[PDB]
Design a protein around this ligand. Sequence first.
Ligand code: E58
Ligand code: MN
Ligand code: MN
Ligand code: ZN
Ligand code: ZN
Length: 145
Amino acid sequence: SMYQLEKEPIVGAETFYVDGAANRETKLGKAGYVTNRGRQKVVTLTDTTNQKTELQAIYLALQDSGLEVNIVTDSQYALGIITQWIHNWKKRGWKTPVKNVDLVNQIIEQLIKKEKVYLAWVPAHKGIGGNEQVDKLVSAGIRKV
Ligand SMILES: COC(=O)c1ccc(OC(=O)c2ccc([N+](=O)[O-])o2)c(OC)c1
Ligand SMILES: [Mn+2]
Ligand SMILES: [Mn+2]
Ligand SMILES: [Zn+2]
Ligand SMILES: [Zn+2]
């Protein structure tokens, strides 16, 4: 492949819980992260979509992290489109996606700069863990929780 994502989390490395949220009626949205070393960032966006904000959040996690990074997302699409891009690069049966192609290409360029990346999906869920904290932050003023 272009790259090999980790098969289990990287012990000792900082973990970024990413999320994004958008509203279809206004195309306003937010993307961000909270980490297990007490970092957080939330950005407000215009002209966006839910899939775009989930991807943007991963982009911020890659931009702001060290060379080894754990990333937990609740977006099956974001995980799938990134993993598929890595697995099929420069190979025969690859047609590049049309939707979000510029943003995914920006993410891949950041990804291959890292030493090790662990990227994993969890279903959205309630509680007081990491995914639930960032979900509240990106949902504020974007939709009812
Ligand atoms: C602010 O309104 C929103 O658009 C919004 C979007 C996502 C939210 O939670 C998630 O991250 C999420 C839900 C479903 C998925 N998913 O990947 O199928 O992810 C959310 O929780 C209140 C609100
Ligand atoms: Mn989400
Ligand atoms: Mn969420
Ligand atoms: Zn606009
Ligand atoms: Zn290292």
